[PDB]
Symmetry: D2
Subunit: 445 residues, 4 copies
Amino acid sequence: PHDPSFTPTQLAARAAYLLRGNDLGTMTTAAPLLYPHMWSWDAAFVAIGLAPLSVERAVVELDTLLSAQWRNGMIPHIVFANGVDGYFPGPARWATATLADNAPRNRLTSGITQPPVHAIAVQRILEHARTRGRSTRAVAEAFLDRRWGDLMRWHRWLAECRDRNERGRITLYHGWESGMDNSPRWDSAYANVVPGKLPEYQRADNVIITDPSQRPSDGEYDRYLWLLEEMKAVRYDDERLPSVMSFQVEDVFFSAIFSVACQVLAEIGEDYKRPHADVKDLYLWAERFRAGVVETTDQRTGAARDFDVLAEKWLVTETAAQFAPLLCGGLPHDRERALLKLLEGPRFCGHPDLKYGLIPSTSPVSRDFRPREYWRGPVWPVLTWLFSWCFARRGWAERARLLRQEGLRQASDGSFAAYYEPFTGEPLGSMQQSWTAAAVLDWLG
Amino acid sequence: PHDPSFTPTQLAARAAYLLRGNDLGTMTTAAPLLYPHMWSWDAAFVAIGLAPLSVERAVVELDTLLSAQWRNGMIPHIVFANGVDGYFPGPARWATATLADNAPRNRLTSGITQPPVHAIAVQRILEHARTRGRSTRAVAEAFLDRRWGDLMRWHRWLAECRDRNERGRITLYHGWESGMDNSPRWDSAYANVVPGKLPEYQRADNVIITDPSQRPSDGEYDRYLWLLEEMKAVRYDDERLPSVMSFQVEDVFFSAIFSVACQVLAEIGEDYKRPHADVKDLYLWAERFRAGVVETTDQRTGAARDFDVLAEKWLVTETAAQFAPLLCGGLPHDRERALLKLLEGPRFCGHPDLKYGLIPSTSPVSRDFRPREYWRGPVWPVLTWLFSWCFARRGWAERARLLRQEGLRQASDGSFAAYYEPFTGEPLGSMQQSWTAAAVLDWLG
Amino acid sequence: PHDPSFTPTQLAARAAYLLRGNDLGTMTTAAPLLYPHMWSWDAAFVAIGLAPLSVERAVVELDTLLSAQWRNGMIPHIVFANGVDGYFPGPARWATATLADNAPRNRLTSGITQPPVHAIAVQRILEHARTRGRSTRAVAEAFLDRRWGDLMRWHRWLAECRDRNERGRITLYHGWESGMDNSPRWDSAYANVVPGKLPEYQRADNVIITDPSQRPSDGEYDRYLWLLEEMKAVRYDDERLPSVMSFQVEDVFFSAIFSVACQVLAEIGEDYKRPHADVKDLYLWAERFRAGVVETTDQRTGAARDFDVLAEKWLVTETAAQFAPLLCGGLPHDRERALLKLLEGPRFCGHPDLKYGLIPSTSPVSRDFRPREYWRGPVWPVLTWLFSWCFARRGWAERARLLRQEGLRQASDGSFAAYYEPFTGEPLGSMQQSWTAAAVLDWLG
Amino acid sequence: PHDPSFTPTQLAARAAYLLRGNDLGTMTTAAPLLYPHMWSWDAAFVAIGLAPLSVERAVVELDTLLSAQWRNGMIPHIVFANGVDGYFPGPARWATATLADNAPRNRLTSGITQPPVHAIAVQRILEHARTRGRSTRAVAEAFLDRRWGDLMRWHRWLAECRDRNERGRITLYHGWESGMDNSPRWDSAYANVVPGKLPEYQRADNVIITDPSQRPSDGEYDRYLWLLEEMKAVRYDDERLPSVMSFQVEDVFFSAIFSVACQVLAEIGEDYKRPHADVKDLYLWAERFRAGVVETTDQRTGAARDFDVLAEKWLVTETAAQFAPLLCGGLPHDRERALLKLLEGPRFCGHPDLKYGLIPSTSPVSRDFRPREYWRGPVWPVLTWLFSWCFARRGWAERARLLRQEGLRQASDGSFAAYYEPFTGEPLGSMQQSWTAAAVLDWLG
Ligand SMILES: O=C(O)[C@@H](CO)O[C@H]1O[C@H](CO)[C@@H](O)[C@H](O)[C@H]1O
Ligand SMILES: O=C(O)[C@@H](CO)O[C@H]1O[C@H](CO)[C@@H](O)[C@H](O)[C@H]1O
Ligand SMILES: O=C(O)[C@@H](CO)O[C@H]1O[C@H](CO)[C@@H](O)[C@H](O)[C@H]1O
Ligand SMILES: O=C(O)[C@@H](CO)O[C@H]1O[C@H](CO)[C@@H](O)[C@H](O)[C@H]1O
């Protein structure tokens, strides 16, 4: 009435209450109605949010995701909950249980992947478990015992089948795999996707989120759904995808996340006496992908670039993905200072009209910028969380703390939206988004 | 490892997480396995705990309890969840759906009552709703519209059928109705309960809580279960119970709670323009029960006494029920100072061996005292909460704040036990007790 | 910075830092440059703010003020610091050292009084001291032994010399004694003050606060200063002031405070075994001034009126002093509901343009309202504190909490201003005002 | 009281109150009676604790200390307050005013130095100042303009005059310069100090701290004071001390601090456009002293050793200074894991008898350990702070957080003692130690 913002204790309670209310038993939905299934990197953040509440339940979330891992090691980006419709494309559309030789038995999953933040979740679970004593450490250690092999096969499938040429960058076959469906990053690559005779379909996402300004366009879904046909045509075979996919991009943000993830998992590997060969491979991949990320960077600004494998050209766009090198490290000293100056200046966190000192998903001074349209400009708490956590890991304590503080100030309305209008702070997209409650729960301590 | 206590934000999140994990949909269990149904005054406290998380869901909890109200107005102390066994005595044992003309249709309930803290819950819901704006106030106001009549019939059934002689004290026909099953208060009244040929039975409560020191004795359950037979024999008829029950006591703590509750509901009645006749009746009952409570008190110490209606004598015991007059008011000035001195001195909160400055359920210097045995000595957070809240209502801000502070310090292990050992602080009884999470959620703000 | 507000720990730290910065050694200035001496009711709030920091130093503050008490029991409203200039009217202009037979012998002070909030500060000191252990309890109990007689003579002087006709209201001979210099309450009384040959003077207050819209006018100071001449002419003789003073009002807000103070001090007397005859007198005065406040009240709204003794008429103004009866109690239930409704509705706390849900010194819909002008409209943290504390003592826990929370939100800029613009929140008057830091500390310490 | 610990707001308030109480105007005493002057590295921590309270006053603290800098760039370890007695050795005993050609002209100071934590305080001031807006930024930037040259001459004096052979370690001529007077690190060096005709003296430190188990022995003071005679004999001439001093050690902990300080100051120089030649020198010294620290390290555990220059041997002791390499970095990955394992295991933080998970000044399993005796065992909040801050800068967020939390839990008694008994938590040394209040404020402000 005079202040509709919640106290930190109220906010934490409401966040935990949302997370438990989205739990179907062994998996947590990403959002009640818009995303009523398990999503891959959402589940990682959800496990980060459960770790303060229940190490046992946080571990279960990851167990459920890994039970859906493909025979080649790929973690698919959706694990469908039994009987739940209302999300398109659903399991019938992917038809992975029919066509994919590597699809898991008695789980319905999608046929593409999503970024490897999972090792970060494992670290948070272990750090929480160490503060809780003997029996709770045993739960988390038993999880490592049971799942170390599966985490390795996840990291090895990325390194070996999505970086076939040892370039230290991850190749994607769908914008969905980047986590940033309609980012300006992929526009020119999608412009070259000319769909054929696409089996007719009817969206479900914009029945729930009805504002057209907040979701992709019907022209964009036509390209998204046509890439699926191309995959279905080759039965999702890794060896055949390079030859048939109309969309092939190296994703520098995904690559930087993978480098961090390998480094995190290698340190876990040493602390818990995992095999030396695995630890050595993880450090190898962390350095390889650190270097591949750095190779994309503007020698002046340090901004990281995506690469269109088909067009054979660098993708120059002004999104938060430019800051990938800050996550994983490796830039020369001068180039990193310039990139931090870009991050803090008028083109991103320093823009005079922003309500919060947070990272907009696209630069407000970019021609591509749209204040309400999903990844084309809104501020996403999940990015705030990932940048903050990675910055703290770099030693940039005060930078990390400013992002956390502004992110809590933004979240303190209690909507738990997935993204926010960068100028007015209006919550957008789905409310009750699980990974926004998780970010809040992890921040509050 | 060095400090297994949670931060206030961690504690609030864990409390909300427990409450949602105990929600079956429209009702919240009192504890996961020991009490897997809805209990009456537990549900009131649960609604207090839900009010910071969701006014809509808090209101639903009370709606579900009131849907189980009997035709004469009585709120029964258990509302059984469909299909759930593992609590004895269950619905088959009560047989209320068969024998009780006033039992509700399509709800299975017990046949006895429990204290009227419900109006207190309504106040907390309204106070929360007023801080949340237009649409949330409308939810809470619509609840008053829909349930004011049911709350009146609850209060009127207590005033008219459990105080038949207008003594301003509530008569009970079972120790369970007091909320304090095995309190020393009822020992001499139970000594006069000589059971007949009691249909054989097997407990469930001490299969779950296996420490015999923490639950009543088999001799005590034999008396508890024999009173049920006597009620069943007269088909739970109000008019016939005075003539047949082997246990008839006026409960001064219950009476004081009813006085407060009438006062609270009368003020709600005025603020929301309820009928004048109802408001006038509520103020009448609050004064009548204030006076009946005061009439029981030691003219020196102010300690309130229960009354054995059958033996026709005052029950002098040294439990926290002695402090009933502090809840509702009405003592002469000198007598209240003496009662507060008793509360703060070596016999209760001032006892030198207590871990926390909290109210033990029985005085540690009493011969009846048992440090682990349920209501014979342990510290109960639900009592801490009720005393604190009532003290604040009396204007005793600093007293209330000390109880809240010690109660949070006690709860900060995160067990959410129903009672604690008064000397060592060991959590006892059931963990994951819903009303202990609710107390914590209400305190933290 | 996107938000200039401090966290609770930063704010508490900054408030304590301020309070110690204003410490001259044995007295705390009311503000660094505007008020560089000890003021009487500021010193009580300073003692309250010191008590979470140091019971010993809080006791010293009251000891110093009480060492300046007059021989007849009056506590003067200013105790000047040795050799300190920069405030007018200074010691020279009051001439109490050469003229007042009752002025203290080794202290320079003013010649008029101020509200008796002192017993409230003694209660807060005692409440802190009991949480701090035995040597701290002993410090507080030794202050009681040393000063109980002085506090009694303070209250007795008010009850006997400023309520000569036992009307249960306090007579003021200067608007400064009300604590609200330029309140609209006193305009019609001040219109009947006609200065004679007033010795020339130069103001110092508006040299420091230069914005003329925040301080009284020259015309108003002409009358304030002439009243000093009338008192000097009769050498501050208690007996002669009814016959010579051109200003004589019964202050209903001062009277209500005295009622509370008497009741608080009587309860201290009982707890600490002070003479029964003293406690009885205090309870007698508490009741008399409660009744005296209620006799002024409007029959429809319960609003309290001041009385102009010279003109024999009730003073009807729309200022925060109308809510005096909420402080001391006494109104019939129906009239206090009306008065609470006036406090919360659109004329005070509920006015739609107010930035904070707080009590403006004058109603914004009154013709007397000026948003910048001292006591004619601005919101004063010190009044928020006093109403919050009195409301909690009435048992209005939620009301007291809402005032505290809005008070903290307003104070969270760290300006510690004496008063604030009610619509914009602009800090006004002196920054670094000791009693505003003291309010914040009590609300948080 | 059942728990003597303060809430975070009360603690922050009490720490700020203390810091202002020790303020003499332009300098803060290190403690009220034991150390009633300005100490050099205490003044840096005081600046850090002042920065959340007042950037202007924090800048003044450093300005005052830097106004006492010698003409050759040395910052002396004591700046005496005018006319203040009560500490020995006082200005008379040092005789720097009459003897030291480089002593400042309008300040009385000591003749030896102390660790260069000052650049860390400048970073904290700058970090606070950027959150506070433009006039505060301008205050901090103007301090940089005024004092950048003085900070450069401070670091240059250390790099050139105390590392004459460019070994990348700092040479001390007095155990007091290490900040750890009686550390076991220096015992074998002090055994080779043989006093000649030492002018008689009377201690003042153990008049204030009377418990002889908390301070050094007379024998130890005999050697501390004789070293002053050796320096006086050559008039504190930098060039002559290698030839005359009976004490010459390379302090590896001081060296690591200087490495960090150089790196922090170089980053400030870049951000604020200071001369490139200065920034290059700072990065050069940061690398040189990093390498110099790593060259001392044990090949199995990574533990750093001090060097006795006169005897030409590594000093192997088990004190917190072994963990110097954790501060500045430089160790091979495998050796730093071993060193972290030593820090956390049963010889330091993981010792089973420690009350708090904190770093004892000497390992409890060492033969040199004394639980009460100054730097021979007690836990010092100031070291907790420095390790926590350095650990966060390394990117060890969770490690830094655990030290902070245990540090706050230990400080929550409000004693603000300089050091604590490691097993019982008893506060020791001087209460009201300014740098302990400063640690708490930084951890909370
Ligand atoms: O819009 C969609 O259909 C899906 C496609 O997988 O994408 C969005 O929702 C997911 C669940 O929150 C997130 O994992 C993505 O990052 C986000 O962009
Ligand atoms: O032990 C039992 O079987 C039941 C009998 O109804 O009693 C206990 O559990 C209830 C649920 O928590 C509480 O309502 C009671 O107050 C408490 O004493
Ligand atoms: O303006 C003045 O000269 C003085 C005269 O007493 O009055 C103001 O300052 C005092 C000190 O803070 C307060 O005690 C008053 O309430 C406030 O009105
Ligand atoms: O004991 C002394 O006389 C002095 C000599 O410098 O040393 C102690 O006190 C100083 C001021 O707090 C600290 O700076 C030191 O680190 C600490 O060891």
